Amino acid sequence: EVRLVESGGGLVKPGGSLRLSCSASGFDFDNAWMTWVRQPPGKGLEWVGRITGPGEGWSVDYAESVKGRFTISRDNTKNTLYLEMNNVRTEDTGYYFCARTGKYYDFWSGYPPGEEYFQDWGQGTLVIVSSASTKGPSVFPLAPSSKSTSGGTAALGCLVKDYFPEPVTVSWNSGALTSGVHTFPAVLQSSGLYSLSSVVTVPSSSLGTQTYICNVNHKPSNTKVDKKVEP
Amino acid sequence: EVRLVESGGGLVKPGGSLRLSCSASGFDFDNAWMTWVRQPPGKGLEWVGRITGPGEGWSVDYAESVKGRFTISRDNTKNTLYLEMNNVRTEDTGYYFCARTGKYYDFWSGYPPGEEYFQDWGQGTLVIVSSASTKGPSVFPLAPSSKSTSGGTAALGCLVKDYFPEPVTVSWNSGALTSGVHTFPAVLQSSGLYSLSSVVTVPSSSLGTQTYICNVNHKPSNTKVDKKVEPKS
Amino acid sequence: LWNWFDITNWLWYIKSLFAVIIGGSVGCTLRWLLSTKFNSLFPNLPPGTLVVNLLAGLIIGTMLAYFLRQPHLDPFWKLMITTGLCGGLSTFSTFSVEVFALLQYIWALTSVLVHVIGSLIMTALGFFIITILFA
Amino acid sequence: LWNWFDITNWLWYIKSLFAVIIGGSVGCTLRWLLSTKFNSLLPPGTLVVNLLAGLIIGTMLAYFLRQPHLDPFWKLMITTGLCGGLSTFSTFSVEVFALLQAGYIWALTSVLVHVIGSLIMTALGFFIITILFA
Amino acid sequence: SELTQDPAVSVALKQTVTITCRGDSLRSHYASWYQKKPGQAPVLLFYGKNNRPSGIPDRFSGSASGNRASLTITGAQAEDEADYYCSSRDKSGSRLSVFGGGTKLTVLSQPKAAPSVTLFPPSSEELQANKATLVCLISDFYPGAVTVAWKADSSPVKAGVETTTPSKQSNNKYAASSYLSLTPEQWKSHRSYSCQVTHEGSTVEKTVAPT
Amino acid sequence: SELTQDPAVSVALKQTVTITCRGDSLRSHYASWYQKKPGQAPVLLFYGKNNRPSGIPDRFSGSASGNRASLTITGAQAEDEADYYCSSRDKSGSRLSVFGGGTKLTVLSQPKAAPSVTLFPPSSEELQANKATLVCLISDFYPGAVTVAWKADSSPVKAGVETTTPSKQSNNKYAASSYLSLTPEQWKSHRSYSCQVTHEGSTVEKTVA
């Protein structure tokens, strides 16, 4: 049936170039209006641009923040939509969705040029735009104290600081600990580097003897830091 | 089917009164517009008047020459139309026809109040209006001469003059003669009296001995004049 | 049972209405076009609502001399051309708005004078033309 | 769809046309009545409709300026339709020369009365509406 | 008489003729066409825009223009020799209806023939009776239409005249008669009295006088 | 953003809620409503005068007036806790389309709970490393929305802060974290540093030194 798949996102330094592609199937692709819509991380959806259909001469309209830098096109034979991103700004980070764009105009209340809607979407494709190169993480210990003990339970953790790019995967005692563990979503610092935490909650009595180890893992730089936490 | 019969015509002296009746059948009488139309003798048809139908309140419109003297009405139960002629003038002589009056109006070219037409007619009914009383005819002979002989045939006749009312019936030799005979339509004189002729054409040799007799007959005054025609001097 | 006289009168009036409906639904349309497309091009003396007034004056002035000396036709067409076409094409209201839109004083009186005298000389043009060409 | 922009523009113009068609096919009708029945009696039928249209469109200049935003549709059918069909500059122009060709006091009275009165009707409308909810 | 027709008009057999009615009302109202034979009732033949009632042959057709209406007879028949009347309103917008003068259609289906005239003076009887009637008998002519005039020493005698309408004889030719009424003093104190028949221009004139 | 929404709004289960979008173009053009869960694609929910595409349950209904439009959710369900976006033109008569800010719908399906916050100073290692990162871990609260502020001797520290978005734990309660970055000279030449969590008004505030 109707399928749209985006492709070609990833890393790119500011000022670079990239081509996002949308393989389309399950409907008359040769006539459907198409629209790009991107979501920056932790933001709302933003309409990028829309190429028209055959009746309109394949006109394309662009969002102002993008006009002059992005170019939309289409291969009705290969059944694919293209977004060419040139001279990139870090703003353009985020996921990118191609969407089949239905057109609407009620005859009596209408006002040209109607209003377009977006019935069918792809799942996205992540474009990251930062100058930061690859980098392993410094792993520092979050050591329990009386401010971390909760009468019968205490919480200790691992700060996985300054790394790039996502993701890191923390575990504990080589995957022995499941209960107690919550590894957080990583925050990103203005250094262009990420830092998450992981924390396990465990007996307040087991402190001072029992062996607690977190096993960080960062495939993008092939690092593997293992660390013990003790009061 | 559709039948209209008029009734009640005849003789009436000037100033008199008369009621002509139209028995109607074979259609919805109770709603049809009705019209009188009379033809004077030797004249054209003249629309007299028209009574409307139920939707119009039984309005009646009259010809100008008749307005004030004639009155149209109707019995939708007896299915008859009535024309009451009062204070009559000799003009109103002639046959009288009731006619079922269709109505017509084409939406595009029309102009109120449309135009009425006359689909179904009666046979008429004769109203005569003259002061002349009954009177038998004087019968004088049209005697053949050299102005009437046509070499081998000659024409002789009978003048049936000054009588009233129509008709007289002439024959010849008590109906022995058929061939040769032509009895004319009567003319009417300003005396209010008619006068016709009859003429038979016969051998120009048969004059001087053979017996030619015309047999006038006027039932309205019960006269019966028989007369011989013989050459003059 | 609706009275023939009244039936026919009202039917005639319905045709004479249909007439004006068509004549005016064309005459108005023309003025709408000329005004919307040609009023943006001078606020002191808007020429769309002036073009339609001058044109309607010319047409009905052509037809006063015409439908007075040329009968044998129909009030049908007279009416849809006079009190329909030349009523829909013409207007006194859209000219009245802009005069006070100038008041609220030299072009507000220029509007008056130009509109009146010119749409009258259009009637003069029409009558002139028609009575002269076929005298 | 065969240039969507143009399809929608034309359909919108078709609504805005239907508007003027109805507004004018009523406005004209009213004037036809007032004129035919009140011109036989400075013909006042074609003057009544002019004064009335002046009053209406003068009520609505102050209205569609301080009370807009509701719809352009009805603006158009009420202004350039109703008050164009009810009003006329032509049927007033004929009778002026019908007085001129006949021979000049009432031909100028027609001018003055028509213009100044149909203007004071706009004044009536504007000040009525703006005073009503000032 | 607001509706006007030409009084008489003929046509040869199998030909086509048109009777034309005229009048102001005819511009604003339609007409109706009626056939009328003597003694027989009128026959509706057509009305309105294009209405031919059932039974009326297809060859009858109404027409309307400017101020004129017309009945069209296509393919003349001998059974169309009749009178024809238009009928409409008297004026534009009246409820009163009105007929035209009528039009006498001759269907020329016999060859023309001359009038044979036979003229009688009074008789010694009628003169003894103090009356005087001259009789003029016109026979054996076609078509049925004749003009009679009486002359007293070749002077016009426009009073005392009465003339019948031509009636079909036995040989399908027509015949009419004319009676001139005089006082016997007039009849003896003149030298001649003449009956004058005009048929299709032909002026046959027979004359009698105190024998 | 000519199209304007209220950023967040909630509703109890099986109740009814309405998200309202506003802007100039909305008077002259209709809208379209899109549901959006994390990772999952946007879902068209409604558009135009009265068009609900097939599959979208009956409970979703669009509305339009004056300069506003609204999505109506009748009978709230836990599988509606998502983001919702209006979409229309940017200005009246433009081919350019535009989305609203979006509205975060919480479907109150759990009882409210207080944030338990645990605060770590730097470690002797990171201080040896010449870095200093304070860690503030907020757990076991509901709903998932919190305000964090850092105080240096009870003064505002608006720089060096980075705060994560609450994620569902295992007990269906949420949890988030906040990292305050300082130079060790700053950290030693102050007497106190405090992480301050505000959850539904409640100001829990823990302090290290």
Side-chain angles (χ1 to χ4, degrees):
Chain A
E1 62 289 77
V2 184
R3 352 227 315 99
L4 301 173
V5 221
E6 299 85 7
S7 56
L11 215 63
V12 39
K13 289 160 166 54
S17 291
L18 210 59
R19 175 179 296 99
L20 303 166
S21 317
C22 175
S23 56
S25 43
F27 62 89
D28 176 22
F29 174 79
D30 306 67
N31 276 243
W33 288 26
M34 285 317 240
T35 280
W36 288 102
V37 166
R38 53 127 177 263
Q39 187 184 14
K43 279 270 194 171
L45 303 178
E46 181 181 12
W47 181 90
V48 186
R50 176 231 56 237
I51 183 158
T52 48
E56 307 76 18
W58 315 99
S59 152
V60 203
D61 278 299
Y62 298 127
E64 261 297 335
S65 55
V66 137
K67 184 164 92 78
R69 320 190 294 103
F70 290 5
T71 291
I72 297 173
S73 45
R74 48 188 321 176
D75 245 311
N76 322 77
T77 78
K78 327 176 76 60
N79 273 13
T80 54
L81 168 74
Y82 304 132
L83 175 50
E84 292 154 65
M85 311 188 297
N86 300 325
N87 180 69
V88 175
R89 319 196 62 176
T90 57
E91 285 80 347
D92 309 319
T93 47
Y95 295 82
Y96 278 79
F97 311 85
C98 54
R100 187 167 79 98
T101 304
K103 303 153 293 175
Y104 182 89
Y105 188 107
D106 183 76
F107 173 50
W108 267 132
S109 55
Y111 191 1
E115 38 275 334
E116 317 165 16
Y117 51 100
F118 310 117
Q119 39 210 344
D120 292 293
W121 297 69
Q123 283 181 346
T125 187
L126 178 51
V127 167
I128 318 173
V129 176
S130 63
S131 49
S133 85
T134 213
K135 188 203 174 307
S138 309
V139 175
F140 303 114
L142 302 165
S145 56
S146 49
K147 314 116 163 200
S148 171
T149 50
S150 161
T153 40
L156 48 80
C158 285
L159 161 72
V160 184
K161 200 199 160 198
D162 288 344
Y163 66 99
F164 187 93
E166 272 269 68
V168 287
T169 145
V170 192
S171 59
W172 285 87
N173 289 342
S174 291
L177 305 195
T178 307
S179 199
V181 171
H182 184 262
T183 307
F184 282 71
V187 82
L188 164 139
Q189 305 151 269
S190 68
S191 67
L193 305 168
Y194 300 95
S195 299
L196 60 63
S197 289
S198 185
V199 258
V200 65
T201 49
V202 272
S204 280
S205 66
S206 63
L207 313 178
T209 38
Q210 298 296 322
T211 295
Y212 288 121
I213 303 174
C214 73
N215 332 89
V216 197
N217 198 323
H218 183 215
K219 160 257 258 262
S221 63
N222 280 307
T223 332
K224 268 176 192 178
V225 173
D226 301 293
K227 196 99 173 181
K228 295 195 187 169
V229 256
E230 289 176 26
Chain B
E1 60 284 295
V2 183
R3 349 224 328 99
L4 303 172
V5 221
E6 299 85 6
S7 57
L11 216 62
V12 37
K13 329 233 157 164
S17 289
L18 210 60
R19 175 180 296 99
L20 304 165
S21 318
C22 174
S23 56
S25 44
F27 62 89
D28 176 22
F29 177 93
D30 306 67
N31 277 242
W33 288 26
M34 284 317 237
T35 280
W36 288 103
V37 166
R38 54 128 177 262
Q39 187 185 13
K43 277 305 213 83
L45 304 179
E46 180 180 12
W47 180 91
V48 186
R50 176 231 56 238
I51 183 158
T52 47
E56 307 76 18
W58 315 99
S59 151
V60 203
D61 278 300
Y62 297 129
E64 312 166 350
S65 52
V66 137
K67 196 232 277 183
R69 319 191 294 102
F70 290 5
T71 291
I72 296 173
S73 44
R74 48 189 321 176
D75 242 314
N76 322 77
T77 78
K78 321 216 168 191
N79 272 14
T80 54
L81 168 74
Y82 303 133
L83 176 49
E84 292 154 65
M85 311 187 298
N86 301 324
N87 182 70
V88 188
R89 320 192 64 179
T90 57
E91 284 82 344
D92 309 318
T93 47
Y95 293 81
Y96 278 78
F97 312 85
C98 54
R100 187 167 79 97
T101 305
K103 305 154 291 176
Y104 182 90
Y105 186 107
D106 185 77
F107 178 49
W108 292 122
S109 50
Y111 191 178
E115 39 276 334
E116 318 166 15
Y117 51 101
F118 309 119
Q119 39 210 345
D120 291 293
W121 296 69
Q123 283 264 32
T125 187
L126 177 52
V127 167
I128 317 173
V129 177
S130 63
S131 48
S133 339
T134 213
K135 188 203 174 306
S138 302
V139 174
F140 303 113
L142 303 164
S145 58
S146 50
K147 336 291 166 193
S148 171
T149 50
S150 161
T153 40
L156 48 80
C158 285
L159 161 72
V160 184
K161 200 199 161 197
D162 288 342
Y163 67 106
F164 187 93
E166 271 269 70
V168 282
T169 146
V170 191
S171 57
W172 285 87
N173 288 343
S174 291
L177 305 196
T178 306
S179 197
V181 171
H182 185 263
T183 307
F184 276 67
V187 82
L188 165 137
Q189 305 152 269
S190 68
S191 67
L193 306 168
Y194 301 93
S195 298
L196 61 63
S197 289
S198 186
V199 257
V200 65
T201 49
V202 272
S204 280
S205 66
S206 171
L207 314 176
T209 267
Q210 300 290 325
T211 295
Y212 289 121
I213 303 174
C214 74
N215 333 88
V216 197
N217 198 323
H218 183 214
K219 326 283 215 303
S221 65
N222 280 307
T223 332
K224 269 178 192 180
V225 175
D226 300 73
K227 195 102 172 182
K228 294 195 188 171
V229 256
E230 285 179 27
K232 44 176 289 175
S233 292
Chain C
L1 311 177
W2 298 294
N3 191 336
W4 168 271
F5 304 146
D6 307 3
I7 282 183
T8 58
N9 267 69
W10 287 332
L11 281 166
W12 188 64
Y13 261 159
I14 279 171
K15 192 198 68 194
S16 306
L17 178 271
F18 187 77
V20 179
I21 254 197
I22 289 188
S25 84
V26 153
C28 280
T29 285
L30 308 180
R31 164 175 52 97
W32 166 38
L33 309 189
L34 275 155
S35 297
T36 51
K37 309 286 287 184
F38 300 84
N39 262 14
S40 57
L41 314 176
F42 208 66
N44 296 317
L45 191 66
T49 63
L50 180 61
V51 152
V52 298
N53 258 2
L54 300 165
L55 181 63
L58 173 66
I59 300 166
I60 239 185
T62 48
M63 304 318 264
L64 172 67
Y66 184 84
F67 283 132
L68 157 80
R69 236 179 299 277
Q70 162 65 358
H72 118 290
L73 3 91
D74 214 313
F76 186 6
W77 297 48
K78 296 196 313 182
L79 222 67
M80 73 143 53
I81 277 164
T82 55
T83 46
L85 179 87
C86 303
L89 182 77
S90 65
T91 178
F92 216 104
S93 56
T94 330
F95 148 75
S96 72
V97 151
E98 294 137 357
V99 173
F100 182 75
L102 294 166
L103 293 167
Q104 192 177 21
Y105 299 114
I106 301 295
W107 282 103
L109 187 63
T110 308
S111 301
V112 178
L113 293 154
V114 168
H115 255 267
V116 176
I117 305 178
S119 196
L120 188 273
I121 199 67
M122 297 296 159
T123 286
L125 286 161
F127 197 131
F128 269 156
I129 287 165
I130 298 306
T131 188
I132 289 303
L133 207 279
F134 280 104
Chain D
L1 231 297
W2 332 323
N3 198 325
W4 165 273
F5 309 143
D6 302 10
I7 281 182
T8 58
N9 266 67
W10 289 333
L11 285 163
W12 189 66
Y13 263 167
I14 280 172
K15 343 169 190 329
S16 310
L17 180 271
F18 189 78
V20 178
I21 253 198
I22 289 189
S25 86
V26 152
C28 280
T29 285
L30 308 180
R31 165 175 52 96
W32 165 38
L33 309 188
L34 275 155
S35 297
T36 50
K37 316 319 298 300
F38 300 83
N39 263 13
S40 60
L41 319 174
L42 197 65
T46 61
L47 179 62
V48 153
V49 297
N50 258 3
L51 300 164
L52 182 62
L55 173 65
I56 301 166
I57 237 184
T59 48
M60 303 318 266
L61 172 67
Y63 191 82
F64 295 143
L65 172 69
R66 210 153 298 286
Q67 229 305 307
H69 106 267
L70 276 180
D71 221 316
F73 185 13
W74 297 32
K75 298 193 316 184
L76 220 66
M77 73 142 51
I78 277 163
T79 56
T80 45
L82 179 87
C83 302
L86 181 77
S87 65
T88 178
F89 208 97
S90 56
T91 330
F92 148 75
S93 72
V94 152
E95 294 137 358
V96 172
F97 183 75
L99 294 166
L100 292 168
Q101 198 175 20
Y104 300 114
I105 301 294
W106 282 103
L108 187 63
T109 308
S110 301
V111 178
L112 292 154
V113 167
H114 257 266
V115 296
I116 304 293
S118 47
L119 188 273
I120 199 68
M121 308 326 242
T122 285
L124 287 162
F126 194 128
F127 85 71
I128 281 171
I129 296 304
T130 10
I131 290 305
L132 169 140
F133 244 105
Chain E
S1 62
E2 271 118 340
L3 293 202
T4 298
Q5 297 172 244
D6 298 321
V9 130
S10 54
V11 72
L13 197 44
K14 268 264 211 166
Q15 250 47 78
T16 287
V17 69
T18 278
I19 304 94
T20 68
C21 195
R22 295 186 166 96
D24 292 9
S25 51
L26 281 186
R27 321 223 295 171
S28 328
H29 301 272
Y30 282 102
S32 356
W33 285 93
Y34 302 96
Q35 186 191 151
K36 173 75 175 57
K37 311 192 191 296
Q40 308 176 22
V43 173
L44 180 49
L45 295 172
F46 210 93
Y47 59 100
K49 168 178 155 75
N50 192 346
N51 313 75
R52 184 194 318 102
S54 325
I56 302 147
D58 48 8
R59 49 183 205 271
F60 288 83
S61 33
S63 325
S65 70
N67 90 314
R68 350 234 145 76
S70 293
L71 183 78
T72 320
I73 288 175
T74 75
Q77 311 259 342
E79 60 262 65
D80 293 335
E81 203 180 18
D83 286 0
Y84 297 90
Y85 302 83
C86 44
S87 173
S88 177
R89 306 305 189 175
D90 62 353
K91 304 151 179 178
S92 291
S94 176
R95 330 189 257 237
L96 309 171
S97 305
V98 135
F99 287 86
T103 299
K104 183 104 194 71
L105 166 63
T106 317
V107 175
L108 243 28
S109 37
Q110 289 229 332
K112 228 197 245 305
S116 201
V117 177
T118 318
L119 175 66
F120 298 99
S123 58
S124 187
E125 296 199 23
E126 192 188 54
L127 289 148
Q128 279 276 57
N130 192 20
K131 310 258 211 299
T133 287
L134 288 151
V135 172
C136 189
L137 295 147
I138 321 134
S139 64
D140 280 321
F141 59 90
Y142 198 104
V146 266
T147 279
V148 186
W150 296 84
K151 267 153 50 184
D153 306 326
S154 303
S155 292
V157 197
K158 19 204 170 179
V161 194
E162 278 295 324
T163 285
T164 76
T165 259
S167 38
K168 286 253 196 177
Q169 287 168 132
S170 56
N171 43 47
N172 259 26
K173 291 194 281 182
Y174 292 66
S177 54
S178 175
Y179 309 77
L180 167 56
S181 308
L182 304 145
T183 85
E185 284 63 28
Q186 298 160 343
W187 160 246
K188 285 188 176 183
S189 68
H190 283 123
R191 267 179 296 166
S192 162
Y193 269 92
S194 307
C195 176
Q196 210 133 325
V197 177
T198 293
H199 171 58
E200 318 308 76
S202 283
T203 306
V204 186
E205 177 230 75
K206 304 281 281 193
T207 294
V208 293
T211 180
Chain F
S1 57
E2 289 89 333
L3 283 281
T4 298
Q5 299 171 244
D6 301 319
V9 130
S10 57
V11 70
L13 197 56
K14 277 137 190 167
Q15 256 90 114
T16 48
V17 70
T18 277
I19 305 94
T20 170
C21 196
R22 294 180 161 96
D24 289 19
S25 330
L26 240 176
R27 71 153 206 245
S28 327
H29 300 273
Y30 285 102
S32 358
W33 255 272
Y34 303 96
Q35 186 189 153
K36 172 74 175 57
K37 315 205 148 198
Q40 308 176 23
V43 180
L44 180 49
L45 295 171
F46 209 93
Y47 60 99
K49 168 180 158 75
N50 193 346
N51 312 76
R52 184 193 318 102
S54 34
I56 303 147
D58 49 359
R59 23 210 285 284
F60 290 83
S61 33
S63 327
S65 75
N67 87 316
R68 44 137 94 155
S70 294
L71 183 80
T72 321
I73 287 177
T74 74
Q77 310 230 358
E79 60 261 65
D80 292 334
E81 203 178 13
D83 288 2
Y84 298 90
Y85 302 84
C86 40
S87 171
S88 181
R89 305 306 189 175
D90 65 349
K91 305 140 191 168
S92 290
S94 176
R95 345 195 204 253
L96 309 172
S97 305
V98 136
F99 286 86
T103 298
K104 229 305 176 187
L105 166 62
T106 316
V107 176
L108 272 323
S109 309
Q110 310 254 137
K112 142 186 297 195
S116 198
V117 84
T118 315
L119 177 65
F120 298 100
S123 58
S124 185
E125 294 196 24
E126 193 186 53
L127 290 148
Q128 281 289 353
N130 191 21
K131 307 261 204 298
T133 287
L134 287 151
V135 172
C136 190
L137 296 148
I138 323 136
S139 63
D140 280 320
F141 57 11
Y142 199 101
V146 259
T147 279
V148 185
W150 296 85
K151 267 153 50 184
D153 306 325
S154 304
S155 292
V157 198
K158 252 271 192 178
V161 192
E162 277 295 324
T163 286
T164 78
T165 258
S167 38
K168 287 255 196 176
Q169 286 167 133
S170 57
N171 42 48
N172 258 27
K173 292 194 281 183
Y174 296 62
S177 42
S178 174
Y179 310 76
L180 167 57
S181 308
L182 304 146
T183 85
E185 284 63 28
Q186 297 160 344
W187 182 75
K188 284 183 176 180
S189 69
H190 284 123
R191 265 178 293 166
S192 161
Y193 268 92
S194 307
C195 176
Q196 209 133 325
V197 179
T198 294
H199 171 59
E200 319 307 77
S202 84
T203 305
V204 186
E205 175 231 76
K206 297 270 267 204
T207 294
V208 293

